[PDB]
């Protein structure tokens, strides 16, 4: 009776932006314990599982999570207490059924995920094994190649830049520990460069800069300078570059065009899907770009197909809002040859079970799974363990400042350290979707 869940308790806490979220605590009869904190996205995909907010404009601007917390304590708890802490799938399924809606809108995806994660961590604690081992079994070894959101554009930046994120990726590093150092050193060299230019070195939600660049090319060219300044190569043997275009954010839903004037000021390109592909292609041709996320709009299936046809053999194409970590959508992307990669955000779908189903479905189509943070993060580092548990090979968990990002990198350092000689780092070979 030691392994039986005796307590499931949620409380309201704050994410890395100072907005409410929640965490759940799970205890077994034996006293094994797990805590699950939930992240939150800024701009959420139209098709994401529902994150339940209170909507009370007198508390936290209506962003309270006390309703979700109540749901955990008064509904989910009664249903889950009594399960063996190790019956992850059964528990995730029970919560899905208990909610009864496809988008988890009754109990809230954040309520459900908090329990889902807390239960798993409690089970790992109960078995006295690392979380990546509990989740993945014995054959966990691959530290993920990180893509690091070093420069920001899009809505929040005031530079004339449409793309939300510009990342660097230490594909040439021998270990994760060294890749991490590479990234940090380039980050710090970038800061120095920005100061010398008289640009702002304060950071955005994910710990990167949003400097007033001349535009997209200036940003990318500035990153390459930082890379060289730090003493690294720009290419497959060193550090490569990637985008999160977040094109749904400037996709004119009515004109169904990609309106750059939105972020790059009037007189900027307005592109059709075709012209959108051409643009991305020009950039891939110009620079050492290894990956592009949401180059097309979450619902521009035709555009995705074309893009994947044109670039999918040269460049990784990651569906984020396109797939919302949902096997229903990924299964279709696969059938219709759209994208060759999926960004995995656990709170887009809401259970570890469904998250792991998405990761497995991806692998089996030859797609990479890039485990991701959200813009609103916590001190939790579960996605580091998910990345290694599944030997995913890649992770997107932020720039090299802010503990909401660094906590994941630190956890990956611990995991690499505990794995010792078994630890692997695939670098450029992470991209089995490009036959590397």
Residue numbers in the entry: 0 to 435
Quote the original article:
SEN has been proposed to contribute to the virulence of GAS by serving as a plasmin(ogen) receptor. Although SEN has the ability to bind plasmin(ogen), it also catalyzes the conversion of 2-phosphoglycerate to phosphoenolpyruvate as part of the glycolytic pathway inside the cell. Alpha-enolases are typically homodimeric, however they have been found in some bacterial species including GAS to be octameric, consisting of a tetramer of dimers. Each subunit is made up of an N-terminal domain (residues 1–143) and a C-terminal domain (residues 144–435).
The crystal structures for SENK312A and SENK362A were determined at 2.15 Å and 2.10 Å resolution, respectively, and were consistent with the wild-type protein in terms of octameric structure and packing of secondary structural elements. K312, on the other hand, is located on the outer edge of the octameric ring and is not involved in oligomerization. This may be the reason why this mutant behaves more like the wild-type protein. Differential scanning fluorimetry (thermofluor) experiments showed that the thermostability of SENK312A was similar to the wild-type protein, with the melting point of SENK312A and wild-type SEN corresponding to 61.3°C and 60.6°C, respectively. By contrast, for wild-type SEN and SENK312A, only intact octamers could be detected. Surprisingly, two SEN mutants bound more plasminogen than the wild-type protein, with the percent increase in plasminogen binding for SENK312A and SENK362A corresponding to 196% and 341%, respectively. Interestingly, the activation rate of SENK362A (3.73 x 10-9 OD/s2) increased while SENK312A (1.237 x 10-9 OD/s2) decreased, to 1.75 and 0.58-fold, of the wild-type activity (2.123 x 10-9 OD/s2), respectively. Enzymatic activity was reduced by approximately 38% and 46% for SENK312A (81.2 nmol/min/μg) and SENK362A (71.21 nmol/min/μg), respectively.
